[PDB]
Amino acid sequence: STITQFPSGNTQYRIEFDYLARTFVVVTLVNSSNPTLNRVLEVGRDYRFLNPTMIEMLVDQSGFDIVRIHRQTGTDLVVDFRNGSVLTASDLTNSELQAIHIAEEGRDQTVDLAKEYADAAGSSAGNAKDSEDEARRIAE
C-alpha cells in the first residue's frame, strides 16, 4: 500500500498514503525495459505541491513509461524526553506513529521478495513428494 505505480503521460497525480512530513515522499521515473537509466526528481524545480494530497509535474516525460511514488521514513527521533518537564499527549502520539509507520514499510518491503521464493519452494516440494510417494507405493 506504500508503493504505487501509474502510467506516464499525464500532468497531475494523486497521493494515497499518510505521511508525517513533506520530505518523506519520493518521485521517480521508471524505464521498464532497461532499469539502469532511472532518475530521481527533486522538489522545487521538477514538481510542486497543490494541496496536501495532489502534485503537479513540470518536466519532459520522454523516454519513460511508469511513474513511481513511495514513502521513506527517517530514523532520527522526533521528540526528546527530559526530566522536569510536563507530559503531553501529542508527544506520545507522534512517538507511536513513527514506529508504526516504520514497521509498515519494513513488512511491505520484505513480503515482496519473500512470497515468490516461498510458494515456488512449497509447490515444488509438494508436487515432488506426492509424485514420489504414490508412484512408489503403487509399484510395491
Radius of gyration of the chain (CA): 23
Of the candidate residues 12, 36, 86, 137, the single one contacting another protein (CB under 8 A): 86
Is 67 among the residues that bind a copy of itself (CB under 8 A)? no
Residue whose C-alpha cell is 513509461: 65
Residue whose C-alpha cell is 515482496: 112
Is 26 among the residues that bind a copy of itself (CB under 8 A)? no
Q: How far is the CB of 23 from another protein (least distance, A)?
A: 5
Is 66 among the residues that bind a copy of itself (CB under 8 A)? no
Is 18 among the residues that bind another protein (CB under 8 A)? yes
Question: For residue 24, which amino acid is it?
Answer: F
From residue 61, alpha-carbon distances to 1, 41, 64, 94 in Å are: 25, 12, 6, 37
Convert residues 87-126 into a mask of x (bound to a copy of itself by CB under 8 A) and - (unbound).
Answer: xxx--xx-xxxxxx-xxxxxx-xxx-xxx-xxxxxxxxxx
